[model samples]
Target: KVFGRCELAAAMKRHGLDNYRGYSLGNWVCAAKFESNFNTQATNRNTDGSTDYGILQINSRWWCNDGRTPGSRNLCNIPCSALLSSDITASVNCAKKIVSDGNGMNAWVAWRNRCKGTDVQAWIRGCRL
Candidate 1:
């Protein structure tokens, strides 16, 4: 699903992303906004020959295996294809794993370039819980 602003916030919150690891739900919302424009099936290819997949655009280089990106880590141990599904299970899980490291939300450039030090509450301002 290509979720609307508030809808995506609700989904992220439902996935237990609210204030996860010191980052607010809005932090995640803003990341996805720029990463995939909330489009679950979004994909982008990097010059390094690694492809990013899904809403958080999890990279195939280290997070998932596309069976094509040579030496892909599959740290998430999930097929890159799974990240494109609207279910968001794989996206959320892998995203959490990526941020759980020392970099936290900095793992996503979207979070750093757009969300860092910004008030992201506007990203999830309305639409109730």
Candidate 2:
């Protein structure tokens, strides 16, 4: 339970990443909302010529080499399943890089600008690991 996914989800929700609906979590929800409409299990073969995967809509083909096969099992440096399997805090942290660095959301700025508006606990509610 070191990096629980629910804890990460709650953290994201508390930060206002998710909407009134409790189905999604984090800036991931926002990322998905804007990028793919909160589809955690969505996969798209980019016509721009790229490969993407999973709910967070990660480009595993470029980042970790997941290629075009549906639900491929290779995870490169950080195993997505291992990350999602238990350590969600780490998963969220991992997602931060994908969102912030990999995708260029600049989440630090977004978190400070957007998430700081709400009560800290509101973002972290039930997010204990």
Candidate 3:
């Protein structure tokens, strides 16, 4: 489902994302806003010949297989298309693995360049959750 910022925040909170792996809900929301605007189907081709898939912009290089991209590590062991679904379960799980594996939010450049150290409260403001 395509989510507005508040809806996404609520869902994330409901899914226990507020403190998943010690990362804040604000950071996740802010990262999603910059990464995909909460569009589940979002994808982007990187200059490195890899692709970013889904809401969190998880990279094909390490997380999934686009089928067209060779040498993908597929560490998440999921098809890239799985990340495009409205149900964010797979995406969220993969993201948690990504962060746990050591990148933290830095796995997403959007988070690193934009959300990091910023006032992310607006991403969750008025969620009432």
Using lDDT as the measure, name the better of candidate 1 and candidate 2: 1
Which stretches of model 3 miss by more than 4 angstroms? Answer: none
Error of 1 at 39 (Å): 0.4
List per-candidate RMSD values in Å: 0.8, 9.0, 1.1
lDDT of 2 at 10: 58
lDDT of 1 by residue, 33-113 (tens): 999999999999999999999999999999999988997688999999999998987899888899897889888998899
Worst 10 residues of 2 by lDDT: 82-91
User: Which wins on lDDT, candidate 1 or candidate 3?
Assistant: 1
Each model's lDDT: 0.90, 0.44, 0.87
Query: Candidates ranked by TM-score, best first?
Result: 1, 3, 2
User: Can you write out model 2's per-residue Cα lDDT over 46-106, one digit (the tens) per residue?
Assistant: 6655545444445554344443445543434554443333323433445554554433444
User: Relative to the unseen true structure, what is the C-alpha lDDT of residue 20 in candidate 3, on a scale of 0 to 100?
Assistant: 85
Please list the residue runs of candidate 1 whose C-alpha ends up more than 4 Å from where it truly belongs after superposition: none
Q: List the residue pairs that clash in candidate 1.
A: none
Model 3 / residue 109 / CA error / Å: 0.6
Give the worst 10-residue stretch by lDDT in candidate 3: 101-110
